[PDB]
Amino acid sequence: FXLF
Amino acid sequence: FXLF
Amino acid sequence: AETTPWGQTFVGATVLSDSQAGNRTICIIDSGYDRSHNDLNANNVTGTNNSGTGNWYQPGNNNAHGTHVAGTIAAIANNEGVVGVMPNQNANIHIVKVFNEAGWGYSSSLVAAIDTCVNSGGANVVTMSLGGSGSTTTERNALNTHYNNGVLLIAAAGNAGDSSYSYPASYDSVMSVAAVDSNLDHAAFSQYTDQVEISGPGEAILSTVTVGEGRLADITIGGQSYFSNGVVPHNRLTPSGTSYAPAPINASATGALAECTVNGTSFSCGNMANKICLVERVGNQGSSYPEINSTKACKTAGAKGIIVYSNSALPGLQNPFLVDANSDITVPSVSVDRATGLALKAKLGQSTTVSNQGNQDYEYYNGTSMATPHVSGVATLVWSYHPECSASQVRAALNATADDLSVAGRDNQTGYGMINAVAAKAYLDESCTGP
Amino acid sequence: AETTPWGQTFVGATVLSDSQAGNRTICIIDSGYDRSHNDLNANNVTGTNNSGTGNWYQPGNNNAHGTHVAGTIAAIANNEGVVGVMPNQNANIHIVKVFNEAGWGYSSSLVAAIDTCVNSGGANVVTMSLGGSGSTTTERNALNTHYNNGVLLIAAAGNAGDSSYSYPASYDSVMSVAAVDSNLDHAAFSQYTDQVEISGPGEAILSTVTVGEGRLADITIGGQSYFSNGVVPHNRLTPSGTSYAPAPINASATGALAECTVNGTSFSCGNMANKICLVERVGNQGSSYPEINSTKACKTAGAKGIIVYSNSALPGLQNPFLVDANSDITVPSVSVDRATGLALKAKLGQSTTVSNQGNQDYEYYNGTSMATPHVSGVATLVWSYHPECSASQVRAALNATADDLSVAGRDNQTGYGMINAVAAKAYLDESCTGPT
Ligand SMILES: [Ca+2]
Ligand SMILES: [Ca+2]
Ligand SMILES: [Ca+2]
Ligand SMILES: [Ca+2]
Ligand SMILES: [Mg+2]
Ligand SMILES: [Mg+2]
Ligand SMILES: [Mg+2]
Ligand SMILES: [Mg+2]
Ligand SMILES: [Mg+2]
Ligand SMILES: [Mg+2]
Ligand SMILES: [Mg+2]
Ligand SMILES: [Mg+2]
């Protein structure tokens, strides 16, 4: 703000 | 990366 | 048939029992949970919907990350698919969907999502395979409060391949998790910082994904499959405008197994026409993406199928990007670890079938996001044996019993080392503070 | 004539001599230094050029920030312009220009800039009125090492008006500086965090800017100027597409002074035709931009010139944004502090000239970037009296002697309080560790  |  | 991905075995989840896990609740803040999946449907799972992300039990399209994470934590043991850290439908799982296909869509903040996990889900453990570069005092304070109140917070370190701090992982109240491969080598992409606390399986991690969105591979010789050894379908990328886009080759190829010998930096493939070409990987992903070199050597030789095995530098199972600038690899190609590649050497000359299949319900992923659920899953499992211990005590137990990796002592790449469920449990067996 | 901005007086720079400053070197990592400026030309200044930012001594166009910062630290005492913390041409200054008009233009990283300050500049103090939201271990380690090696690091906390951490300010090795106004009130834009350590003048700070790029205001009555009192030309903004853009009114107006009455939130301006309208500010900048209210009340009444003075809530000198949605304010308007507004009441009825003029060499700025140089300038000034004390010891002295602001004790808004040069010097005079 993501996925990891 | 700004000025403050 | 049900497969146990290497990560599950390495962390020691398979030797313990989740029979008491019903006394624990783990909340997954991610992109949702595909409850329609056969390996996830019958879990003791609940969730709290948010106006910005639809239903927690419906990830949507191309938003399978949360389902992969959930599978690592609790894929159900049932003779099909895979198994997670707590596979026997005992652990309580709560889902908070903050990501949509397009990106973050939660109507509120991460703090609000965590609040939901604790207040609505009754979470004891909150796992977050996500993060951002920014940090704030209000957020730091909120998470510290949850942690001191007894909630164990675990998050991914990030995949930027640098020393940058990703939050929430980098707050003192949260466990920052790094990724390692099946040889326990530090994953090139795993961010290294003085916050990195513990490591978990993060390269070539097989798990559940939204139904039909996955992809798998296989190698068969003599009617037997190497699937359980770990066969990764090449993540092929080809030019798409000002960048690269996925261009997977899903097909099957059969032929006599032949190996392209590697001498220095040159290949000796000979004539691979009508054959399945076995080749050692030359170089490794990091500053570049060399997978195309060994792969192309085989293709140019006329190979019908290609099998690339790990080199001595990184013998573990790798799931690298197959950057195909000229779209030369139009045949099915896969990646296997060094041990598997050497085993295949003894089968040279035998009929071999290599295959990549799309529309699957499982897939191999790389990321600190994959390592994180191994750590939070194990944390929850170990905690179920001693629910009276506090989150801080459990966190300490995990760190104190982790298997030291890389250079001696805690380091920025792997923290205290590889999480060890058995050792952590034995630690708490003595007392909440160890022996 | 030469003006002493309020900040210089408030931090104690005007009563503590910089005669020993020659034994100190302060490095300014910013947007350059206009060495052609009369208040900066004769300083003991040097710099290290970088391939991406031209000459450190030529800021270029619309890139005056570093010059404003430098002026606060060392504008020269020469009977003209202003004066900085160390105005007598003693302190050594090293310049590293990391910003161009377009933004960050340095070919390398912040760490590289700090390395240059130390290696090439021989810096004892490194001042950074800049930052970002990101943080890294490589940075944390490098700065902690420089700090333990004896280099004092000082940086701005940021102007986002929230609790977010801006770096380098938020690293343990760097002093995070907050901004306050002339009444010592916390600036609404100053980020508040548990890293904020000390405060300095950051609202309506007059300093040097690239020659000809500045803007100033003035109020004259009976042939006498109120410039030294602090007169801020309204930072007027008018609609520009989906946002706002600067639309300053630079002109002069003369007329009898008359005051618009304020009752709570209501105005009674009467007929201001041909008059200079004096009016108390209603509301204050923060969640909104109310400057337009008192200003428009005067304009609608027919005022040819306007003077807005601070209310009791924020009596210090304010330099707020005059958001003019309907482009109503087409006359020269200015802002003055409460003391000045009250002092003007005695002049009601007298011919008053209000003027805003561009093409100046000085300008009023707001920001934690303005507070930072007061802190680093004072740190350098104080340290010059005890050069053998360590950076860590000087830092502790500044915090131990700051004048507590806001709530009792250290707080996220103002840290330990307002920097105090005289008190800090007295602390170190006893010993590098202060009183026992
Ligand atoms: Ca299963
Ligand atoms: Ca180690
Ligand atoms: Ca001067
Ligand atoms: Ca205080
Ligand atoms: Mg942490
Ligand atoms: Mg950590
Ligand atoms: Mg280690
Ligand atoms: Mg050195
Ligand atoms: Mg700090
Ligand atoms: Mg600080
Ligand atoms: Mg010394
Ligand atoms: Mg204070």
Side-chain angles (χ1 to χ4, degrees), chain D residues 159-170:
Chain D
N159 314 133
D162 60 23
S163 74
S164 68
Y165 292 116
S166 287
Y167 297 89
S170 300

Side-chain angles (χ1 to χ4, degrees), chain D residues 403-418:
Chain D
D403 295 305
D404 188 21
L405 304 182
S406 187
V407 300
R410 179 181 183 170
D411 52 81
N412 291 188
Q413 288 70 209
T414 61
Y416 288 108
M418 186 69 145

Side-chain angles (χ1 to χ4, degrees), chain C residues 404-411 414-416:
Chain C
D404 191 8
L405 303 182
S406 187
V407 64
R410 181 180 185 172
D411 51 83
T414 63
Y416 288 114

Side-chain angles (χ1 to χ4, degrees), chain D residues 103-410:
Chain D
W104 182 277
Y106 209 58
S107 72
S108 197
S109 66
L110 174 64
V111 168
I114 297 171
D115 284 331
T116 294
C117 277
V118 179
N119 297 317
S120 297
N124 297 122
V125 180
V126 177
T127 190
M128 304 164 282
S129 289
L130 48 76
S133 52
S135 48
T136 77
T137 297
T138 294
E139 285 207 315
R140 191 187 301 288
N141 286 168
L143 278 54
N144 177 245
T145 291
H146 275 307
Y147 175 59
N148 289 324
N149 282 355
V151 183
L152 186 59
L153 308 173
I154 301 170
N159 314 133
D162 60 23
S163 74
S164 68
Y165 292 116
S166 287
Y167 297 89
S170 300
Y171 288 125
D172 292 347
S173 61
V174 186
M175 296 189 85
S176 179
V177 183
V180 297
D181 66 19
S182 70
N183 188 54
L184 300 183
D185 286 310
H186 170 250
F189 60 75
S190 192
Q191 280 164 55
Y192 47 102
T193 75
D194 48 13
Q195 275 285 319
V196 172
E197 190 164 344
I198 195 165
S199 300
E203 176 67 26
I205 304 304
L206 175 64
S207 192
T208 53
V209 292
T210 304
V211 176
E213 294 188 350
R215 189 188 181 215
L216 296 172
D218 199 5
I219 294 171
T220 304
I221 301 177
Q224 294 293 65
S225 170
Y226 286 87
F227 188 88
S228 70
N229 285 58
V231 186
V232 181
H234 267 332
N235 187 182
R236 178 176 181 252
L237 307 180
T238 54
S240 181
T242 175
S243 186
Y244 279 98
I249 297 296
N250 294 325
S252 177
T254 298
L257 189 67
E259 176 167 24
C260 179
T261 306
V262 171
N263 186 319
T265 50
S266 308
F267 297 104
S268 182
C269 294
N271 190 347
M272 289 290 166
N274 286 174
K275 309 293 186 185
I276 291 298
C277 188
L278 178 67
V279 64
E280 184 186 65
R281 172 178 295 117
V282 169
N284 281 118
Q285 178 167 303
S287 56
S288 63
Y289 301 103
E291 198 67 359
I292 186 64
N293 296 316
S294 289
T295 310
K296 186 175 179 178
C298 273
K299 179 63 182 65
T300 297
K304 62 190 305 179
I306 306 175
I307 300 171
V308 176
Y309 68 95
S310 303
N311 48 228
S312 298
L314 284 182
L317 180 61
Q318 309 301 315
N319 173 203
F321 285 104
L322 173 62
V323 181
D324 197 1
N326 295 300
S327 302
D328 294 334
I329 314 308
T330 55
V331 299
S333 56
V334 304
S335 168
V336 299
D337 66 18
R338 188 165 187 71
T340 300
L342 292 178
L344 283 164
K345 286 173 173 287
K347 307 300 179 185
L348 290 166
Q350 295 178 48
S351 185
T352 301
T353 299
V354 177
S355 66
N356 288 327
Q357 188 178 183
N359 301 300
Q360 300 302 303
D361 308 329
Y362 309 87
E363 192 168 358
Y364 279 88
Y365 279 15
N366 301 153
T368 47
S369 295
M370 282 60 260
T372 299
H374 282 92
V375 175
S376 59
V378 164
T380 306
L381 173 61
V382 170
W383 202 357
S384 72
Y385 282 85
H386 300 287
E388 287 306 302
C389 296
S390 70
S392 296
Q393 285 170 154
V394 173
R395 181 176 181 181
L398 299 177
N399 294 332
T401 61
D403 295 305
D404 188 21
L405 304 182
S406 187
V407 300
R410 179 181 183 170

Side-chain angles (χ1 to χ4, degrees), chain A, chain C residues 129 131 159 369:
Chain A
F1 35 77
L3 300 178
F4 283 117
Chain C
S129 288
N159 314 313
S369 296

